[PDB]
Symmetry: C2
């Protein structure tokens, strides 16, 4: 009953991936809430459970499928289903633990991992940092297979963690940032796989802080700058929402918008 | 040979005034230079004399006409012609004095006033502040007649100065600020005459500072806020170009734009 968006790595093109990410954004955010031209995800406070999640059904050339569940309030992957088994990251709190009972409700085998699905924890489990995990259509094809075979013993934990890291960046971070979507489109267009450069990593790491700075800004002006990195690792200072309009596609809700207060 | 734009107070409507101000902006600025969506006037440095001025020919229901000359670099009224006489405000420097010799070149009687055409000086001569000089179609009709009769002794100096104050705000300031154009459209729509409120005056006074703050901003963010006033005289702080996009229509050139420096 939650909305489902389908994507396959089989014969993926720039256009099919673009259509997919556009659909995911459409199901994450409603259009109610736009601050300086940038959409905001729904506020978790008071959000009915029937509106809390979306499902991303991923297929690959190997004819395998898995379904990821994303929380609309922050675009996080909270768990996944493959066949008759579902797995959820360790919940942050009791409300989240209750919420995930509403996902994959007829699956025969439900498991909750003891570990969370944040980047730091997943990198520790993978034995590799994001800067050393290749992304692209081949990585995603492989990730889907690894998730699919987990329940039968074919996938070691570090490979499972790597596979989550790939899915999260190629789906959640691409949905959060047009810039990251653009980086994945380029990989698909040239069928190349490559680890994310510092511009990608620093955006991933800064999403919450950027969301807050934009929402709490004075007419778009940040009280304090945010340091990002360029592709070559050099510093890029962000002082204003304006420079981020081509870059960030949606924000986590961090405060209510101030009154319009137009001149 | 300089471009001429015509306007008449006779049967003026919101649409005829809108057309006029749009034309004036079109002849002031070329489109070369836009910073944060706001056009900039040409830089005075290196600007050829054949591109330096525009002419605004004003007529009224009394069947009188005068021609104002505006400097494209700052939208200032520098002088005017009525029939066989022309009058220029006292030039700021030698280059400006030479420049005005290229205006109204066949007029039989040329005069340069000893006083400048800035608001402070004109208010002193008028014996009234802007806050006590009514604007609207009636004031402008009257101003055109007063300018027209100056050379024949019919217009006292304080009335001449008042008449300049009306023309400058209704033409130059309306061209500089959509907000001020909007205030003059309202006066025309309801055929009411009324002095400018504090929102109008503070914008007029702040045009140079706003131009500089926008041009020198960090991605649109001002280093220091600018205080304006609302219609009721209360303070309104400006921290960013964004809030000014509906308000200011063109800027005086204050610096070269920094490199694009997109992420």
């Amino acid at each position: 009953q939650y909305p489902i968006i389908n994507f396959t790595t089989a014969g993926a093109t720039v256009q099919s991936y673009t259509n997919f990410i556009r659909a995911v954004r459409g199901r994450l955010t409603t259009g109610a809430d736009v601050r300086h031209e940038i959409p905001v995800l729904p506020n978790r406070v008071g959000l009915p459970i029937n509106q809390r999640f979306i499902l991303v059904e991923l297929s690959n050339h190997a004819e395998l499928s898995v379904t990821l569940a994303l929380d609309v309030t922050n675009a996080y992957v909270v768990g996944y289903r493959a066949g008759n088994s579902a797995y959820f990251f360790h919940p942050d709190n009791q409300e989240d633990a209750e919420a995930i009972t509403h996902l994959f409700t007829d699956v025969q085998n439900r498991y909750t991992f003891a570990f969370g699905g944040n980047y730091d924890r997943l990198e520790q489990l993978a034995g590799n940092l994001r800067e050393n995990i290749e992304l692209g259509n081949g990585p995603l094809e492989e990730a889907i297979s690894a998730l699919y075979y987990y329940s039968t013993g074919g996938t070691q934990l570090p490979t499972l963690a790597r596979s989550f890291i790939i899915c999260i960046q190629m789906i959640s971070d691409a949905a959060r940032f047009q810039y990251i979507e653009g980086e994945m489109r380029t990989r698909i267009r040239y069928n190349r796989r490559s680890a994310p450069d510092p511009s990608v990593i620093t955006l991933e790491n800064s999403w919450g802080r950027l969301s807050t700075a934009i929402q709490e800004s004075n007419q778009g002006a940040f009280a304090s700058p945010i340091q990002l990195q360029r592709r070559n690792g050099s510093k890029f200072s962000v002082y204003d929402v304006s420079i981020l309009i081509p870059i960030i596609a949606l924000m986590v809700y961090r405060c209510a918008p101030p009154p319009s207060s137009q001149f």
